[PDB]
Design a protein around this nucleic acid. Sequence first.
DNA 1: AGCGTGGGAGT
DNA 2: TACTCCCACGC
Length: 87
Amino acid sequence: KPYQCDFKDCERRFSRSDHLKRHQRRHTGVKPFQCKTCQRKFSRSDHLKTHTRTHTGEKPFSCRWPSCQKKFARSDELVRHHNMHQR
DNA sequence: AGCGTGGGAGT
DNA sequence: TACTCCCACGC
Ligand SMILES: [Zn+2]
Ligand SMILES: [Zn+2]
Ligand SMILES: [Zn+2]
């Protein structure tokens, strides 16, 4: 992992330069990505994308359990729900 | 429950 | 560099 973070007291290292640059927004507070509906800004474009569903109500992730109609905005919410049904 | 926001990864 | 994804932790 040659891409080391030189910020004060940070010991993180990464194998990819883009992982380091993304990480460094934690230290600087930079939030490049802005929601066009509510104007909130975010550190990461993928988190802007899932945030925008709070406004649209879209829930593309459907439970696969027979006779369950529950749906979710994000994949990990569905993971948690499937775990709940039986594990 | 719903969602902010990291790391690691694939493309 | 760009993008999103899964997985994860946390509140
Ligand atoms: Zn750092
Ligand atoms: Zn918004
Ligand atoms: Zn279900």
